[PDB]
Enzyme design. Structure first.
Site, PDB file in Angstrom:
ATOM      1  N   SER A 187       3.753   2.456   8.805  1.00  0.00           N
ATOM      2  CA  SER A 187       3.556   1.070   8.299  1.00  0.00           C
ATOM      3  C   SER A 187       4.854   0.612   7.604  1.00  0.00           C
ATOM      4  O   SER A 187       5.603   1.444   7.085  1.00  0.00           O
ATOM      5  CB  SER A 187       2.348   0.946   7.363  1.00  0.00           C
ATOM      6  OG  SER A 187       2.555   1.767   6.232  1.00  0.00           O
TER       7      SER A 187
ATOM      8  N   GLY B 146       2.477   7.027   8.532  1.00  0.00           N
ATOM      9  CA  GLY B 146       3.849   7.022   8.050  1.00  0.00           C
ATOM     10  C   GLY B 146       4.712   5.997   8.736  1.00  0.00           C
ATOM     11  O   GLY B 146       5.923   5.992   8.519  1.00  0.00           O
TER      12      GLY B 146
ATOM     13  N   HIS C  30       0.835  -1.220   0.000  1.00  0.00           N
ATOM     14  CA  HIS C  30       0.000   0.000   0.000  1.00  0.00           C
ATOM     15  C   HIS C  30       0.861   1.258   0.000  1.00  0.00           C
ATOM     16  O   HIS C  30       0.368   2.337  -0.273  1.00  0.00           O
ATOM     17  CB  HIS C  30      -1.048  -0.026   1.135  1.00  0.00           C
ATOM     18  CG  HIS C  30      -0.577   0.392   2.499  1.00  0.00           C
ATOM     19  ND1 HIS C  30      -0.323  -0.538   3.472  1.00  0.00           N
ATOM     20  CD2 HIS C  30      -0.505   1.622   3.059  1.00  0.00           C
ATOM     21  CE1 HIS C  30      -0.050   0.139   4.574  1.00  0.00           C
ATOM     22  NE2 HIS C  30      -0.134   1.434   4.379  1.00  0.00           N
TER      23      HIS C  30
HETATM   24  C1  Z1E Z   1      -2.754  -4.359  -0.479  1.00  0.00           C
HETATM   25  O1  Z1E Z   1      -3.380  -4.856   0.712  1.00  0.00           O
HETATM   26  C2  Z1E Z   1      -3.718  -3.941   1.661  1.00  0.00           C
HETATM   27  C3  Z1E Z   1      -3.724  -2.570   1.554  1.00  0.00           C
HETATM   28  N1  Z1E Z   1      -4.051  -1.715   2.528  1.00  0.00           N
HETATM   29  C4  Z1E Z   1      -4.392  -2.212   3.677  1.00  0.00           C
HETATM   30  O2  Z1E Z   1      -4.746  -1.388   4.698  1.00  0.00           O
HETATM   31  C5  Z1E Z   1      -4.828   0.032   4.392  1.00  0.00           C
HETATM   32  C6  Z1E Z   1      -3.512   0.727   4.698  1.00  0.00           C
HETATM   33  C7  Z1E Z   1      -3.535   0.791   6.233  1.00  0.00           C
HETATM   34  C8  Z1E Z   1      -2.759   2.014   6.714  1.00  0.00           C
HETATM   35  O3  Z1E Z   1      -3.241   3.140   6.649  1.00  0.00           O
HETATM   36  N2  Z1E Z   1      -1.541   1.754   7.207  1.00  0.00           N
HETATM   37  C9  Z1E Z   1      -0.939   2.548   8.250  1.00  0.00           C
HETATM   38  C10 Z1E Z   1       0.048   3.617   7.781  1.00  0.00           C
HETATM   39  O4  Z1E Z   1       0.695   4.287   8.573  1.00  0.00           O
HETATM   40  N3  Z1E Z   1       0.182   3.788   6.423  1.00  0.00           N
HETATM   41  S1  Z1E Z   1       1.222   4.908   5.788  1.00  0.00           S
HETATM   42  O5  Z1E Z   1       2.567   4.552   6.137  1.00  0.00           O
HETATM   43  O6  Z1E Z   1       0.704   6.178   6.204  1.00  0.00           O
HETATM   44  C11 Z1E Z   1       1.023   4.743   4.066  1.00  0.00           C
HETATM   45  C12 Z1E Z   1       0.523   5.890   3.293  1.00  0.00           C
HETATM   46  C13 Z1E Z   1       1.934   5.485   3.177  1.00  0.00           C
HETATM   47  C14 Z1E Z   1      -0.565   1.820   9.509  1.00  0.00           C
HETATM   48  C15 Z1E Z   1      -1.729   2.774   9.545  1.00  0.00           C
HETATM   49  C16 Z1E Z   1      -1.570   4.065  10.364  1.00  0.00           C
HETATM   50  F1  Z1E Z   1      -2.304   5.030   9.741  1.00  0.00           F
HETATM   51  F2  Z1E Z   1      -2.151   3.901  11.585  1.00  0.00           F
HETATM   52  N4  Z1E Z   1      -4.972   0.884   6.538  1.00  0.00           N
HETATM   53  C17 Z1E Z   1      -5.434   1.119   7.780  1.00  0.00           C
HETATM   54  O7  Z1E Z   1      -4.681   1.236   8.725  1.00  0.00           O
HETATM   55  C18 Z1E Z   1      -6.948   1.227   8.002  1.00  0.00           C
HETATM   56  N5  Z1E Z   1      -7.321   0.223   8.985  1.00  0.00           N
HETATM   57  C19 Z1E Z   1      -7.733  -1.014   8.640  1.00  0.00           C
HETATM   58  O8  Z1E Z   1      -7.970  -1.374   7.504  1.00  0.00           O
HETATM   59  O9  Z1E Z   1      -7.837  -1.776   9.751  1.00  0.00           O
HETATM   60  C20 Z1E Z   1      -8.383  -3.163   9.712  1.00  0.00           C
HETATM   61  C21 Z1E Z   1      -7.429  -4.111   9.013  1.00  0.00           C
HETATM   62  C22 Z1E Z   1      -8.476  -3.498  11.185  1.00  0.00           C
HETATM   63  C23 Z1E Z   1      -9.756  -3.188   9.073  1.00  0.00           C
HETATM   64  C24 Z1E Z   1      -7.431   2.664   8.374  1.00  0.00           C
HETATM   65  C25 Z1E Z   1      -8.892   2.621   8.819  1.00  0.00           C
HETATM   66  C26 Z1E Z   1      -6.584   3.273   9.499  1.00  0.00           C
HETATM   67  C27 Z1E Z   1      -7.350   3.593   7.166  1.00  0.00           C
HETATM   68  C28 Z1E Z   1      -5.802   0.697   5.340  1.00  0.00           C
HETATM   69  C29 Z1E Z   1      -4.442  -3.608   3.974  1.00  0.00           C
HETATM   70  C30 Z1E Z   1      -4.804  -4.115   5.239  1.00  0.00           C
HETATM   71  C31 Z1E Z   1      -4.811  -5.467   5.431  1.00  0.00           C
HETATM   72 CL1  Z1E Z   1      -5.222  -6.082   7.001  1.00  0.00          CL
HETATM   73  C32 Z1E Z   1      -4.487  -6.363   4.421  1.00  0.00           C
HETATM   74  C33 Z1E Z   1      -4.133  -5.896   3.187  1.00  0.00           C
HETATM   75  C34 Z1E Z   1      -4.094  -4.501   2.920  1.00  0.00           C
END
Ligand code: Z1E
Ligand code: ZN
Length: 193
Positions: free
Chosen positions: A150, A148, A68
């Site tokens: 993950s 930021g 992602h």
């Molecule tokens: C391709 O496959 C995928 C792509 N994307 C996936 O998840 C996306 C990216 C991830 C994210 O923002 N990552 C962070 C992050 O920091 N990302 S980042 O570094 O900012 C990125 C933009 C560069 C660590 C978060 C931080 F925000 F807290 N998401 C969420 O945290 C969402 N919560 C959520 O979905 O919680 C569950 C799973 C409980 C329903 C909220 C609601 C926060 C948006 C949504 C996949 C998740 C899974 Cl499990 C499996 C495959 C996935």
């Protein structure tokens, strides 16, 4: 455009710290060429794309990150752009061969329930394991704090890798828990064609 290393987080001393290695003026040219002659160090790399920044962790000689974040991109290196060795869109997992100087973390085998999340600021946040891929924060944090981060590691008290931080379990802007790719899932990815 290649993913670019812009900093590093060191986890091997007595202090977890971050160090920024690249500014804004160089990132764009390095991204287009995929050629970055800067030296690599540490277990965790702070990486960027066009407008987004996130983490990448070295485990078993592979530098792992979230799909992602990285997508299908190559990573910038001294010899030119490096193509991915692993990609699992369903797991949200990407991996390149680790760069020279990047030290790999050890996969955890003690089966600890007391975990520590590493942020992009090299802050270490205690987490309690609640299943194979879930952990609750001992002190809930707003979502804004975790953005930021993950691709970063979940560590056991001995400092071994338990998982890769993938998503947050959010309720009204507050992160109560975290979802992670277990280190046994990375090992399956390296073994399967
Ligand atoms: C391709 O496959 C995928 C792509 N994307 C996936 O998840 C996306 C990216 C991830 C994210 O923002 N990552 C962070 C992050 O920091 N990302 S980042 O570094 O900012 C990125 C933009 C560069 C660590 C978060 C931080 F925000 F807290 N998401 C969420 O945290 C969402 N919560 C959520 O979905 O919680 C569950 C799973 C409980 C329903 C909220 C609601 C926060 C948006 C949504 C996949 C998740 C899974 Cl499990 C499996 C495959 C996935
Ligand atoms: Zn351990």
């Amino acid at each position: 455009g290649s993913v670019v290393i812009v900093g590093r987080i060191n986890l091997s001393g007595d202090t977890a710290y971050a160090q920024q290695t690249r500014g804004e003026e160089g990132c764009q040219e390095t991204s287009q060429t995929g050629r970055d002659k800067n030296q690599v160090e540490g277990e965790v790399q702070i990486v960027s794309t066009a407008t987004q920044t996130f983490l990448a962790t070295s485990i078993n000689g592979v530098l792992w990150t979230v799909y992602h974040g990285a997508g299908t991109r190559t990573i910038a290196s001294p010899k030119g752009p490096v193509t991915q060795m692993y990609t699992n869109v369903d797991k949200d997992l990407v991996g390149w061969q680790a760069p020279q100087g990047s030290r790999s973390l050890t996969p955890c085998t003690c089966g600890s329930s007391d975990l520590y999340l590493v942020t992009r600021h090299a802050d270490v946040i205690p987490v309690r394991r609640r299943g194979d891929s879930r952990g609750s924060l001992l002190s809930p944090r707003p979502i804004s704090y975790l953005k930021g981060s993950s691709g970063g590691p979940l560590l056991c008290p001995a400092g071994h890798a338990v998982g890769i931080f993938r998503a947050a379990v959010c309720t009204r802007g507050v992160a109560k828990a975290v979802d992670f790719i277990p280190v046994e899932s990375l090992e399956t990815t390296m073994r399967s064609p």
